[PDB]
């Protein structure tokens, strides 16, 4: 290859963090297939892409302004500030009027077309015939009461995004040889056997043991495990699954490769340990520690190509599919489902259920399966139901044909929709059987097509690669694929953040391991900090970057005298940038918390669940004030935050009036936020935003399983906004305490306007969530496979199922959650004071 083309290449490797030309852990060639596989998306959706729009990402929505930001126009005027050459002039604009059309309406109200709209201090743009109300920055100043400034300027040159130009009818067995582990402790003495199973899709085909034996560092079997199954009825995705109890160890095993052949010969796969259920037990990958890990040697020795329903029977098969998602099916259920296939086909919300239903073990009914797709026009023509494609992506299906179709529903979604479940639809490729999937070519042309997905797949991808040993080989694959595709411009765009990120990563975990627990920090602990941090401003660091969790805005150099290192147990550094854009309307710096460690993937999963959320509430016209800060996971326990300005904790408002305890005051809380109001005004508006936050929270954390929380992960805003933190962590279903109550007039028994309005709002927040009872379960379940350590499938999950009050009427359920709000009055500060002494 040439040597440019090497130095690239290295340059990829630098971005991605994993080398993907680097062979160590395979036994077979489908990543490399893979990375061969990917050119071709790739390389269609860089073709089809917009040079101008590409180049100025505007980001927009389909979707109607809800009622409440309707209100905050009374006249059908929105008022945008222009700025241009140190002079600004206010202009009246139209909801319905496009961005060229105000430009149009600007160079007139004078008495050369060639210059865009951006927002001051950003990079945003306003372009394209869509109405300016339908632009995501224009609503998100209604809704905060801020007002639209933008400057007249050139639109980018869409040159600086150019792209380098390309360069048997036997019944199946196995052999298990043995188990072989370095070393073992003396002992004490245990035994050990070890299980075979053919999984498609969770579900167990078919299953093999061995007979125990003491376990030593070596345990040889060498017996031939026939299974009942046929060769020619293995379906295509199967893997075979290998456990080794005393469950201590698993590995998996692709049965059928990614050319359709069957797998064969001898392998030595090397496994994972169980630590002291999870898309973690699905990999098809194999342990890269080869000196330490115990391993399993196997052999393998044996190709494809290439009536009406009766009324009651009907009744029964409407109550399955009105079930949940994660409601199990009988053989009777699956039955019914099988033979009346037809009927099934008519209800999209019974392919999940319909698919569990197939005997994937058997050929010809697969086979059937296929003929069954063959007529889709049902799926094809139903309106997009989000939660019932993620259900088709989940662990239960590895069928690539059912999954495609779930990619097919997934295709119709704007890019405003495609952020929202960005995360989620990542974490899904986990589930994907293959490397090359439609769902991983789905990402790969979204993020290719639009700059805000594919700044945020950047990061979503490299989190994974860098903290999963389990799917970096088959995330490093997709991002190389991305970035080969992305263009010059945001390949240095990337390449500043990067060098930022780590280098700032150094130094966090060099504080880290300069401290203690408080005792405590310290001047010594600050005076290490900004000297480190001295060293990198000169030097050398970027002059800027952008932020990872807003790529709109763009840091400039540190701010070191506010740098500081937070009080806490994990010693996080809190840092502040100048902001780079001189355009920018305010002086106000960037804050940034580097924290290590907590796990800042469970924040993600949390806080896009949240935004999902809070997306059903604004097309019921509701706004419950929530407040996803920015959180990006970078490292295994490592990342960075979102620094709101203007914000404390709940605990540290308790300690301000009183100290180190844990005696809590009821009044606390309204004299901090009636001291914090400049007027009497910012105060009433701010007891309302903590009303809504305060309900908005208390419904999200209660379904979500979170709600018991300590008085230290809770914050608010000097306006009022409440919001949750720290996500990677008697009882009480969510926190309303004495202190929340007494700001909305409510002293324990004693109903109020406030408290009134607080109960009404919970409830319509709580019954609009509960129409969307599928798609809440199946996200929670995503994330706890994906997210947690290993967790029951059966117990842990079900906890949504009674919170979302599922098989209840509106009535039961308005009931149901006032209850709860009760059971909050009864405890009081015991709960939370119990919480206090637990980290005490
Ligand atoms: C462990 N702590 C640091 C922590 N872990 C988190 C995980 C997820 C999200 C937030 C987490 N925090 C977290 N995130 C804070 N963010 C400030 C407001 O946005 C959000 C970030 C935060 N803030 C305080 C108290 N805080 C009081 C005011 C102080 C100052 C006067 C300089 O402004 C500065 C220090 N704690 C204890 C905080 N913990």
């Given at each position: 290859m040439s040597e440019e083309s090497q130095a690239f290449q290295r340059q990829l490797t630098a971005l991605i963090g994993y080398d993907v030309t680097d062979v160590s852990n395979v036994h077979d060639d489908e990543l490399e297939f893979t990375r061969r596989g990917l050119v071709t998306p790739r390389m269609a959706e860089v073709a089809s892409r917009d040079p101008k729009l590409?180049?100025?990402?505007?980001?927009?929505?389909?979707?109607?302004?809800?009622?409440?930001?309707?209100?905050?126009?009374?006249?059908?005027?929105?008022?945008?500030?222009?700025?241009?050459?140190?002079?600004?002039?206010?202009?009246?604009?139209?909801?319905?009027?496009?961005?060229?059309?105000?430009?149009?309406?600007?160079?007139?109200?004078?008495?050369?077309?060639?210059?865009?709209?951006?927002?001051?201090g950003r990079d945003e743009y306003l372009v394209g015939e869509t109405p300016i109300k339908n632009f995501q920055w224009v609503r998100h100043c209604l809704k905060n009461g801020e007002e639209i400034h933008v400057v007249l300027d050139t639109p980018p040159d869409p040159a600086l995004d150019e792209v380098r130009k390309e360069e048997c009818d036997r019944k199946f067995r196995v052999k298990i040889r043995g188990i072989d582990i370095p070393v073992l402790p003396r002992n004490t003495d245990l035994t050990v056997f070890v299980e075979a199973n053919i999984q498609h899709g969770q579900q167990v085909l078919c299953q093999r043991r061995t007979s125990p034996k003491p376990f030593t560092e070596e345990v040889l079997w060498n017996v031939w495990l026939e299974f009942s199954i046929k060769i020619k009825d293995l379906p295509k995705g199967a893997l075979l699954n290998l456990q080794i109890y005393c469950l201590l160890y698993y590995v998996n095993l692709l049965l059928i490769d990614h050319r359709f052949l069957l797998r064969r010969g001898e392998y030595v796969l090397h496994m994972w340990q169980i630590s002291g259920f999870n898309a973690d037990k699905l990999t098809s990958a194999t342990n890269p520690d080869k000196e330490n890990s115990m391993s399993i040697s196997i052999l393998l020795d044996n190709h494809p190509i290439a009536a009406e329903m009766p009324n009651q029977l009907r009744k029964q098969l409407e109550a399955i599919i009105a079930t949940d998602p994660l409601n199990p099916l009988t053989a009777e259920d699956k039955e019914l489902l099988w033979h009346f296939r037809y009927e099934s086909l008519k209800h999209p919300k019974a392919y999940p259920k319909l698919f569990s239903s197939v005997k994937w073990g058997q050929q010809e009914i697969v086979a059937k399966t296929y003929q069954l797709l063959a007529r889709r026009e049902v799926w094809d023509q139903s309106a997009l139901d989000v939660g019932l494609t993620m259900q088709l992506l989940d662990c239960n299906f590895s069928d690539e044909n059912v999954r495609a179709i779930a990619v097919q529903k997934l295709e119709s979604l704007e890019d405003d929709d495609v952020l929202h479940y960005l995360l989620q639809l990542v974490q899904a490729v986990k589930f994907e059987p293959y490397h090359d999937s439609a769902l991983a070519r789905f990402l790969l042309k979204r993020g290719l097509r639009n700059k805000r997905i594919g700044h945020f797949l950047f990061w979503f991808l490299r989190s994974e690669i860098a903290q999963s040993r389990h799917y970096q080989q088959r995330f490093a694959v997709i991002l190389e694929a991305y970035l080969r595709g992305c263009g010059t411009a945001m390949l240095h765009d990337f390449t500043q953040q990067v060098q930022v990120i780590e280098m700032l990563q150094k130094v966090t975990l060099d504080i880290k391991s300069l401290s203690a627990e408080k005792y405590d920090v310290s001047s010594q602990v600050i005076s290490q900090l900004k000297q480190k941090l001295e060293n990198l401003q000169n030097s050398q660091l970027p002059e800027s970057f952008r932020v990872p969790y807003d790529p709109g805005l763009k840091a400039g150099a540190l701010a070191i005298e506010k740098c500081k290192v937070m009080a806490s147990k994990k010693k996080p550094l809190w840092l502040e940038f100048k902001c780079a854009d001189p355009t920018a309307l305010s002086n106000e710096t960037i804050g940034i918390i580097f924290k290590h460690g907590d796990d800042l993937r469970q924040d993600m999963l949390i806080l896009q669940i949240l935004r999902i959320m809070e997306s059903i509430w604004e097309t019921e016209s509701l706004d419950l004030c929530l407040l996803p800060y920015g959180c990006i996971s970078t490292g295994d326990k490592i990342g960075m935050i979102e620094i709101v300005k203007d914000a404390t904790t709940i605990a540290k408002i308790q300690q301000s009036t009183v100290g180190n305890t844990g005696a809590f005051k009821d009044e606390v809380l309204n004299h901090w936020l009636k001291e914090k109001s400049p007027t009497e005004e910012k105060f009433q508006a701010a007891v309302e935003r903590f009303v809504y936050s305060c309900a908005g929270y208390c419904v999200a954390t209660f379904v979500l399983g979170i709600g018991d929380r300590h008085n230290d992960n809770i914050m608010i805003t000097e306006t009022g906004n409440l919001f949750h933190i720290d996500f990677g962590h008697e009882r009480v279903p969510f926190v309303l305490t004495p202190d929340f109550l007494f700001v909305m007039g409510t002293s324990g028994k004693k109903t109020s306007p406030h408290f009134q309005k607080f109960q009404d709002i919970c409830v319509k927040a709580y019954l609009a969530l509960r129409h969307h009872t599928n798609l809440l379960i199946i996200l929670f379940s995503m994330m706890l496979?994906?997210?947690?350590?290993?967790?029951?499938?059966?117990?842990?999950?079900?906890?949504?199922?009674?919170?979302?009050?599922?098989?209840?009427?509106?009535?039961?359920?308005?009931?149901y959650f006032l209850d709860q709000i009760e059971v909050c009055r009864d405890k009081g500060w015991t709960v939370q004071f119990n919480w206090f002494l637990h980290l005490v």
């Open positions: 590409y180049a100025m990402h505007p980001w927009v929505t389909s979707k109607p302004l809800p009622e409440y930001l309707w209100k905050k126009i009374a006249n059908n005027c929105i008022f945008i500030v222009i700025h241009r050459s140190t002079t600004s002039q206010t202009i009246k604009v139209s909801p319905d009027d496009t961005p060229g059309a105000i430009l149009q309406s600007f160079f007139t109200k004078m008495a050369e077309q060639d210059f865009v709209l951006r927002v001051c496979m994906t997210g947690m350590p290993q967790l029951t499938s059966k117990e842990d999950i079900e906890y949504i199922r009674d919170a979302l009050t599922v098989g209840k009427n509106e009535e039961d359920a308005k009931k």
